[PDB]
Each structure stands twice: as C-alpha cells, then as structure tokens.
C-alpha cells in the first residue's frame, strides 16, 4: 500500500525452450530487467540467442544451478518453467513416472523455486508458473499439486488458437483461471495458419494416417511456418541454426502456446514497468 | 539457547520406530516423535501424501528429520525437510539423516548429494546428514546410534 | 517513334528455379502481365508458387514445350533462362559437355527463344537473357556464343554482394556491360549477412567454415545465404525442406542484385507501378 | 511458282559431296552446293564452327539441307542450327526440304530428342532417317541408294537435266 515507481521484471526461466516467456513478456510491453534461462538443447539456445539479441543469460543444465547461484543472481520476480514430459505422458508405455527418469527434473523446479521465493516477512510481489501435460498419471498430478501447494488450472490452446493443446498450469499468477479472451489476432482455424495455395482438412490440429493439408492434387503435412502460426509464434521464428525440418518440428512440439502464455502473463502489467 | 530441551523428531524412515529406539538407546529425552511412511506425544500419521506443510507447522517445531530405508522416498523426505527447516534467521539446532543402500544408481547418488548439499558416509549403506562427524568430502540400528551420538550434546538427556 | 501506353511485361522463364526473375521484376516496379515458368524441381516450384501467390503459370519440363505452345501462350516480351551447369563446369570431372548430359538443355532454350522471337518486320521490343557459369570449357563457351550470336558479359556478384559468383550473361538487354551501381541496399560484407552474435571469417563467401559463434566455428545458415545472394530473409523457408535442400536451391540461384542490374533498363519499355 | 529451277543444297553431312552424288544420280540440276563438316559455285567451307547466320544468308537461299553420318548430339545440333538459319521465313511458302541420317544404335533419349526437335518421327531402314520429304512422314513409334529412294520426290520440285 506504499508508492514506488514500477520496476522492470526479473525472470528465472527453467527449461526455457525457445524463450516463449521472454517473447510473451516483450509482446505485453513489460520491461525486462534480466532474463536468466536454464536450457540444454543447443538448437533452442541458438533460437533464443538470435531472436532476442543476446539478452538471455544462459546457465545450462538446471541441475548445475545451486541455491547460492539463485541468491547471487537474484532477486527474481518471476520464476517460470515447463519440465520435460516424456516420462509423465501416459502415451509412453516406457514412462518412468514423476520420480524417475526425466520426470524428477520437476523437483529441480521445486528446488530452485524454494531457493528463489522471498524470505518470510518480505511482501514484495513474486510469481511462479509450472506447466506440464494433462495426459499424465493421476498420481503424478496429485503429487505435483502436493509439492507445489496448488491445484492446477487446465487451459487448452484450442480456445485461442488452431491447436489441440490441453495443459496443466500450476502457479500463483493473478487470475489464472479467469476466462480467456478471444481477440482479433487469434487464428482460431487451421486454414488461417496455412501458406498460400493450401487448404485445411480440419479446423484444429492434433499432436496417424492424417496429412492435415491439401495442396493442389496431393496430400501434405504441416510446414514449420504454418506450425509457428498454429502455436502463435512469429513466422520464421524458428528459422535459425541450420536444423532439419524434423528438429524444428520437435522444438515447436515441446513449446508453449503463445496466446495461452500471453493470457497467463497479462496481469503482470499491473506489477512491473511497461514500455 | 537457555538450556537443553528434549528433542522433537519427524520420521519418514522405513520403520516407524527405528529412530525412537535409537534415541532412547542414547538416553535422549523426546518431547515429540511423529512417524510417516511412503506407501503407494508420539503418533503415527499414515501416508506421507496426507501430510501437508500446515501439518508440519502445527505439529512442529521439529529438531530432527530422518528418512530412508536399509528411490522416490528421497523426494518426500526432501519435501518434509524443506517444510520443517527453521526459517532464515533462526539459528536453533536442526539436524537430519537420510539412509539408503549403496547399490543405487550413480545418478541417484549424485542427485541426492546435490539436493542435500552433502556427500554421503559410506559404511553396505550410504548415510547423508549434517550431524558433526557426517561432514564428508568428495539391522541398521547401531550404526545410526553411532552417527546420532552428537545429538547428546544438543538436547536434554535423562 | 510512335506513341502508345506502356503495357505490362510478358515473361517466359525457363529453368526458373526459385523465381528470381519475377522477384526482381516486382522489385523494380515493373508491372508483370504474365509469367510462364518451366521448372521440374518441386521444391523450387513450391517456393515460387507460395512466394508469388499463384501468379506463376508452371508448365513443367522445358522439353514438353512446343512451338505451338509458345505461339498460343505468347506473345512474350522477355525470355530468360539459366540452364543446369553440372555438365558444363570444369570442376566436375564426369562432365558430359554442352552437347550431352544436362548440357544439351541449353539447346531447348535456343529452341524456344527462336520460337518466341518476333517475326520479321515486327519492331516490337523483345529481350532475352541466358546465364551460365564462367568455369566451363572454352569450346563450350565458344559454341554457346556461336548459337546465340552474342558474346557474353562477365558479371561477378562479389561487386554488389558478399558472394564470389562470376557468371556469363548472353543477351540483348540494354546496356548489360555498363558499370554496376553499388547502392545502399547492397551488403558487400559477409558480416552484414550474418545473424546476431556471429562473426565473419572472410569478407566474401566463396561457395570452409565461414563464421564464428561464441567459441565454435560454424557454417553459413540459409537465412544468411539468402542475405548473401540478395534474397529476402526466409524467402526459401517453405515446403519443409532439409537444410541441404535449401542450400541446393540457393546455390543454383541467380544473384538478386546482379539480375536487378541487368533488368533495370526494362523500366523504359514497360508499364511501371 | 513460275517454273522449276535447279536445286540449292547445304550439306553438313559426314561424308562430303554424298548429296551431290545422289542428286546427280537422280538427274537434278544443281545451282549451288555448300558443304561443311563438324570436325572437333560448289564449295567446301570447312569447320561448321566458322559458318554464321550471315554466311548462310549470303550463300543462300537454300532449298535442301542435309546432315548426319552413316556422342550423336553435336552433329545433330549443328545441323539443327543450320536448318534454322537456312529455313524460309514465315510467309515464304517456297519448297524447302531437309534430311538427317544417323545410326540406329543411339540412346533412346537421343532419338526422342531428335524427333522432338525436328517434329518428325524417324524412318527406319540399319539406320534412322528424319526428313520432311513426301514419304518420310511417319507415325509414332512403338551406301547411298537409300538416300536415292528418299530423295526421289525432289525431282518433282526442282529442275531436272
Ligand atoms: N537438465 C535440463 N536442464 C535444463 N533444461 C532441460 C534439461 N533437460 C531438458 N531440458 C529442456 O527442457 C525443455 C522442456 S520443453 C519446454 C519448452 C518451453 N516451455 C518453450 O515454450 O519453448 C526442453 O527444451 C529441454 O531441452
Ligand atoms: N528439364 C528441365 N526442364 C525445366 N527445368 C529444369 C530441367 N532440368 C533442370 N531444370 C531446372 O533448371 C534450374 C537450373 S539452376 C537456375 C535457377 C534459377 N536461375 C534461379 O535463380 O533460381 C534448376 O532449378 C533445375 O531444377
């Protein structure tokens, strides 16, 4: 209840991927003091390095970040993260679960978040966000909710984009469960995402025996630019680092839906400096 | 502090009474001993999945936190440790021990050493702890008694 | 010496590649009535089909085009073409020469050009351009010059870009040998073509590892190659192609500033936006 | 179309004056015979590489253009350039004939390419003969006396001695 000039936001982003968080914060006009990202995939690091002009400070493997590092690099105002899901998804019959394999990476989040939260008696605003898949074991979801002391919000990107993408979002961001706004920028239909001379079989996309686009006489799969449009990224956002079409598709498949993250981040504008 | 007081214990150990047995074996007074298990006033509280941070607050404060088995149980132990730790600025004594078998994934051993900021005592079993003497560089009852011996210099003995 | 309203240009482009000719004509402001392209590579066809929004009329293999087709699809004001060079380059030791292999594709050009030439007594302006590599056999170059009744102009894209690319241009375009203009859009240095956080080892790429990033040395990216050859960034980011496929398409292409230099005097002959 | 005049010939045939011998064999008057070879008023003019459109224009007009030999691409494409340079311009309905011989042993792609460029299907005889003389009109496929039989219709278009 006291007055002070609003300051730019300080972000710790774990499992950053293609820097969707920084992109969304920039798109909202929120000034970013600093943006520390933990990421191991070199292609994703190159995407974030190029597209944001060396602003991101990369720190490598999340398991190489100590509590002392969080204290010395901080304070942080926002801690975001979406850990790998291959060992959480029920589609994988070889899944090792939340506690083994790559699932236990979640606990790294749980670790660093606890290292990053303000000490008791510090009333400064502090927000965090953890994302993962809906198609996980019920026990895994219960245990994540237990460790994070929060029940998740289910958001499907199909409501504000042309992609079937239901995800769980744990966090304390203001108004996470509030209804999503369908604006004019939203490309609700797959047809709006296709390149010239292509027709969409379906209205929305799924994560076989389906080539979701027709071109002239032939069937065809989605292109990376059209997938970027589907996921809400700028066109040619992932056109860096000389990677194959399949690697680019992999990167886009693991990412966050840009409009969903924009919806989740929008209330931050009333807490931090805005350009 | 102002005098030695009896110890208060939180046990996620495999075996609800190993810690209380060792403590009474060392002659250390016990003001509280709360036992929980992983599954799939001394009191048993059942599944650790039912123990919230609020429960740890209400039942606490705790002076000792023990866990393990002679694994996923480590992360539940770590959660209870975080929930029972004294807040920053509280210099009151607080100790913990986690035991497991040496026959574990090398990745698992490294992960536990990282999370606990401590290297294990090799004895065959691995014992992580912050008791004096468990500082290391880079049944199971009598060994835990030997490791717990420094607790006699921090809490009231009868 | 007579008056008439300037009309949009009608183009026949053989071995069109990624439609560099249409791109250059649009960039000069020249209105394009029609653009008929012969091309067989489906990646290139998709590039030109998307980047120009179905304006290009594709006709497939150049060998499937007859004289009747040229008459019926025409008249044409500009006939351009750059035939495959892998059987003309002395770099290739398995080259079959101008008269065999893919070299003889040149004669298809020679054929269709003669089918598109205005008949005697037709004073209408008519222009043509044929392109190929300098590193060809001297006999093959002599033979091309004899068949086309023209001597080639040597233009190296290194003068208006960051790429070593010397090519022979036969044609009757006005002032092909005139000096090239180095403008402000021209990125003469490889450094000006790199993405953020990369340093250029050399001033002009000669297509080793041409760039440095952080601590590792690296090769050129496709967007950087696009900047090097004068194309818009992400011009070839279509059709789900591997990095080698994009590299292939860009390596066979024309240098955009060079084609702009060659096409610019056409503005005094056809309708301009 | 006033009256029959002696024939004028341009020969890129491998085997000089073969066409002249065949024309004399058929009793056709010859007003001009220009002969050239590919290498690597009856004249031999040497390398076809030295013959230009202007030379064809000045030595012409020509009524008959012959080429071939009893890779195959170079010979045919030189013959093709000469055929193009000597052809009557559009609107000139004067008689103009050509013949190209090659061996049957050739790449199928070569045969299809020659048939495409000449807009004619070959007469098989073993050798291949493309031409526009009456009788060499063929549908789609699935020693000088040969040229004598092929050239027989020429004595109905040009003056005979
Ligand atoms: N040990 C580790 N430390 C840091 N990042 C890791 C990691 N193991 C996997 N990752 C990364 O975590 C990411 C999870 S997918 C999340 C991507 C991100 N939310 C986006 O929108 O782009 C993957 O990109 C993977 O490369
Ligand atoms: N038989 C044929 N008919 C038509 N095009 C052919 C062909 N054989 C090869 N080509 C095409 O001819 C092109 C020669 S490279 C010329 C590319 C073009 N000048 C550009 O700037 O993009 C290649 O793209 C190749 O695909």
Numbering used by the authors:
A (entry chain B): 626 to 832, 845 to 912
B (entry chain E): 628 to 667, 680 to 709, 728 to 780, 791 to 805, 893 to 912
C (entry chain A): 626 to 832, 847 to 912
D (entry chain F): 628 to 667, 680 to 709, 726 to 780, 791 to 807, 894 to 912
Per the authors:
The hotspot DNMT3A mutations at the site of Arg822 (R882) promote polymerization, leading to aberrant DNA methylation that may contribute to the pathogenesis of acute myeloid leukemia (AML). Here, we report the crystal structures of the DNMT3A methyltransferase domain, revealing a molecular basis for its oligomerization behavior distinct to DNMT3B, and the enhanced intermolecular contacts caused by the R882H or R882C mutation. The fact that the RD interface mediates both DNMT3A/DNMT3B oligomerization and their substrate bindings highlights the essential role of the RD interface in DNMT3A/DNMT3B function.
Size-exclusion chromatography analysis of DNMT3AR882H/N879A reveals an elution volume corresponding to a tetrameric assembly, suggesting that impairment of the H882–N879′ intermolecular interaction indeed reversed the polymerization-promoting effect of DNMT3A R882H mutation. We then solved the crystal structure of DNMT3AR882H/N879A at 2.65 Å resolution. The structure of DNMT3AN879A/R882H reveals that whereas residue H882 assumes a well-defined conformation to interact with residues L883 and Q886 in the same molecule, its intermolecular contact was reduced by the N879A mutation. These observations reinforce the notion that the newly introduced intermolecular contacts by the R882 mutations give rise to the enhanced oligomerization behavior of DNMT3A.
